[PDB]
């Protein structure tokens, strides 16, 4: 319902384009911890997969 923050939109764009290591680095720079960046990246990748199977 709510959607995505601008930084999450940037991470989504990077993950769709294939810059996954860049996405993870930007997620670190925006959150502050490796584990939080990993969880955010996994959540956004799952959102991408769900959107793909929904379309």
């Amino acid at each position: 319902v709510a959607g995505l923050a601008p930084y999450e939109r940037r991470v989504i764009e990077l993950l769709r384009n294939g810059k996954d290591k860049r996405a993870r680095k930007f997620s670190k720079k925006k959150l502050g911890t490796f584990g939080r960046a990993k969880r955010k990246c996994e959540e956004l990748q799952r959102i991408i997969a769900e959107s793909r199977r929904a379309h």
């Binding site: 923050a5 601008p6 930084y7 939109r9 940037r10 860049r22 930007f26 720079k29 925006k30």
Partner: protein
């Protein structure tokens, strides 16, 4: 249906607010009175007597109108009647600071984009009214550190060509020298009282009119002899 009349009314009211809040200073009024309008605003032209139911008087001694108009000075003088992407200018301290940050190997284009995907991004600005946009701009300015190099660079960037002339510098030194001279002109010994007679046991200044006074006694004599003995022992 689209709120067009309401939009015009609100815009006019906000503009009137702006003009009165600016003209309650009279320096804005002077600037408005003096400043000349542009031509990109004029562009567009080409570039009952209810009545009842029942020899000339002004004889000016000498058509006359034509012979008085076309016989003018200019009509008598006249015989036989290279021109063929907008530029980006930094004028802001924050923009100059971030320009320094790019010039020096501090942050790159990737860092610029990543930091540009912030909370202020994706904010609508196109179709919003002037009052809303100005309130948002006034109260939503992000704060960033500013560097002295960027501030100085803006200073020489905006420094006027005739801002520092030899004359005004020389007579500025002249006012400063005159100010020190006047301060010096505005700026333009100690007596000893023996505490005997009328001066014995007095709370404050005696009747001796002087700038600085010092009271003396035999106890002070002995103290001074002790201090001199100590100084002599030290030397």
């Amino acid at each position: 249906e689209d709120g067009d009349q309401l939009e015009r009314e609100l815009d006019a009211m906000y503009e009137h607010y702006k003009e009165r809040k600016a003209s309650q200073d009279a320096k804005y009024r002077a600037k408005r009175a003096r400043q000349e309008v542009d031509d990109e605003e004029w562009e567009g032209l080409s570039a009952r007597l209810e009545e009842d139911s029942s020899k000339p008087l002004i004889k000016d001694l000498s058509s006359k109108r034509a012979r008085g108009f076309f016989s003018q000075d200019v009509f008598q003088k006249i015989p036989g009647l290279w021109e063929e992407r907008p530029n980006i200018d930094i004028i802001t301290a924050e923009a100059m600071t971030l320009a320094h940050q790019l010039a020096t190997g501090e942050k790159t284009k990737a860092d610029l984009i990543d930091e540009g995907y912030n909370k202020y991004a994706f904010k609508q600005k196109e179709g919003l009214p002037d009052w809303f946009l100005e309130d948002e701009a006034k109260h939503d300015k992000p704060i960033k550190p500013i560097t002295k190099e960027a501030a100085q660079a803006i200073k020489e960037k905006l420094r006027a060509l005739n801002a520092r002339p030899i004359k005004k510098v020389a007579e500025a030194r002249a006012r400063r020298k005159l100010r020190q001279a006047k301060k010096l002109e505005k700026l333009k010994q100690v007596k000893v009282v023996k505490a005997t007679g009328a001066n014995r046991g007095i709370k404050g200044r005696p009747k001796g009119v002087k700038g600085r006074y010092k009271m003396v006694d035999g106890r002070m004599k002995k103290e001074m002899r002790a201090l001199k003995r100590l100084a002599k022992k030290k030397r």
